[PDB]
Design an enzyme around this catalytic site. Structure first.
Site, mmCIF file in Angstrom:
data_model
loop_
_atom_site.group_PDB
_atom_site.id
_atom_site.type_symbol
_atom_site.label_atom_id
_atom_site.label_comp_id
_atom_site.label_asym_id
_atom_site.label_seq_id
_atom_site.Cartn_x
_atom_site.Cartn_y
_atom_site.Cartn_z
ATOM 1 N N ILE A 11 25.044 39.236 -11.588
ATOM 2 C CA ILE A 11 25.095 39.877 -10.267
ATOM 3 C C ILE A 11 25.678 41.280 -10.372
ATOM 4 O O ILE A 11 26.696 41.500 -11.042
ATOM 5 C CB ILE A 11 25.896 38.998 -9.295
ATOM 6 C CG1 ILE A 11 25.099 37.730 -8.983
ATOM 7 C CG2 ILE A 11 26.262 39.760 -8.035
ATOM 8 C CD1 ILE A 11 25.942 36.647 -8.261
ATOM 9 N N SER A 76 26.813 35.823 -17.222
ATOM 10 C CA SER A 76 27.218 35.564 -15.821
ATOM 11 C C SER A 76 26.104 34.830 -15.079
ATOM 12 O O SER A 76 25.569 33.833 -15.596
ATOM 13 C CB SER A 76 27.631 36.902 -15.210
ATOM 14 O OG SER A 76 28.438 36.701 -14.054
ATOM 15 N N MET A 77 25.727 35.266 -13.875
ATOM 16 C CA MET A 77 24.617 34.636 -13.157
ATOM 17 C C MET A 77 23.294 34.662 -13.950
ATOM 18 O O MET A 77 22.400 33.868 -13.675
ATOM 19 C CB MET A 77 24.430 35.317 -11.803
ATOM 20 C CG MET A 77 23.519 34.573 -10.874
ATOM 21 S SD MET A 77 24.271 32.864 -10.320
ATOM 22 C CE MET A 77 22.529 32.169 -9.658
ATOM 23 N N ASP A 128 38.660 34.636 -18.123
ATOM 24 C CA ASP A 128 37.588 35.016 -17.213
ATOM 25 C C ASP A 128 37.995 34.679 -15.779
ATOM 26 O O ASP A 128 38.197 33.510 -15.451
ATOM 27 C CB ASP A 128 36.309 34.279 -17.605
ATOM 28 C CG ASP A 128 35.069 34.870 -16.950
ATOM 29 O OD1 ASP A 128 35.130 35.212 -15.745
ATOM 30 O OD2 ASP A 128 34.059 35.025 -17.651
ATOM 31 N N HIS A 151 35.777 38.944 -18.057
ATOM 32 C CA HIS A 151 34.360 38.644 -17.785
ATOM 33 C C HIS A 151 33.423 39.746 -18.276
ATOM 34 O O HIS A 151 32.474 39.490 -19.032
ATOM 35 C CB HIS A 151 34.144 38.426 -16.282
ATOM 36 C CG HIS A 151 32.777 37.904 -15.963
ATOM 37 N ND1 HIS A 151 32.341 36.676 -16.400
ATOM 38 C CD2 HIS A 151 31.735 38.462 -15.293
ATOM 39 C CE1 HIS A 151 31.105 36.471 -15.968
ATOM 40 N NE2 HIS A 151 30.727 37.532 -15.275
#
Ligand SMILES: [Cl-]
Length: 171
Positions: A11, A76-77, A128, A151
């Site tokens: 994202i 991530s996403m 994270d 992250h």
């Protein structure tokens, strides 16, 4: 030789998130022109748009190169987009190795799909603060937990780089 690598951002991410990882893999023998980073126009992470976009991108990569499979590195996403593609769309016969970095993986499944045919590695950090490690841990993956890396730091870490290289060459 190595499969083409397709790298999948999260994202608010972009293809240029992977500049560090590309430079690292090039230094380790991957070919720069076979390192692909998709740029989603939809920056919200929505599987509904991004998983079909990923599917189409990979088909173009396979068609252009003549390779039979790609490997994926996802952040991530991007990990959720990747697992949605493999589980619910056509990706299960198109992918050799999947490496996720802080992936939001359990938003899609608790179990890495077809993990006896596809090699999965899930790398995540106890520092994270964006994606909890419990979301990233994937049944049937090599789950690798590290400490001290943020992250976004997962994209620019020598320790993570080595883990990615291992994940892309797993047997
Ligand atoms: Cl963080």
């Amino acid at each position: 030789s190595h499969n083409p690598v397709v790298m999948v951002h999260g994202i608010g991410g972009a293809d240029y998130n992977f500049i560090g990882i590309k430079s690292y893999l090039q230094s380790q023998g991957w070919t720069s022109s076979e390192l692909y980073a998709i740029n989603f126009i939809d920056k919200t992470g929505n599987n509904i748009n991004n998983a079909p976009r990923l599917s189409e991108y990979i088909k173009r990569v396979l068609n252009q190169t003549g390779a039979s499979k790609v490997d994926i590195v996802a952040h991530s996403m991007g990990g959720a987009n990747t697992l949605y593609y493999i589980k619910n769309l056509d990706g299960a016969d198109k992918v050799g190795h999947v490496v996720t970095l802080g992936g939001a993986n359990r938003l899609v499944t608790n179990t890495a799909p077809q993990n006896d045919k596809i090699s999965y590695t899930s790398i995540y950090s106890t520092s994270d603060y964006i994606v909890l490690n419990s979301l990233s841990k994937l049944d049937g993956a090599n789950n690798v937990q590290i400490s001290g890396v943020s992250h976004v730091g997962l994209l620019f870490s020598s320790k993570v780089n080595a883990l990615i290289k291992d994940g892309l060459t797993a047997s």
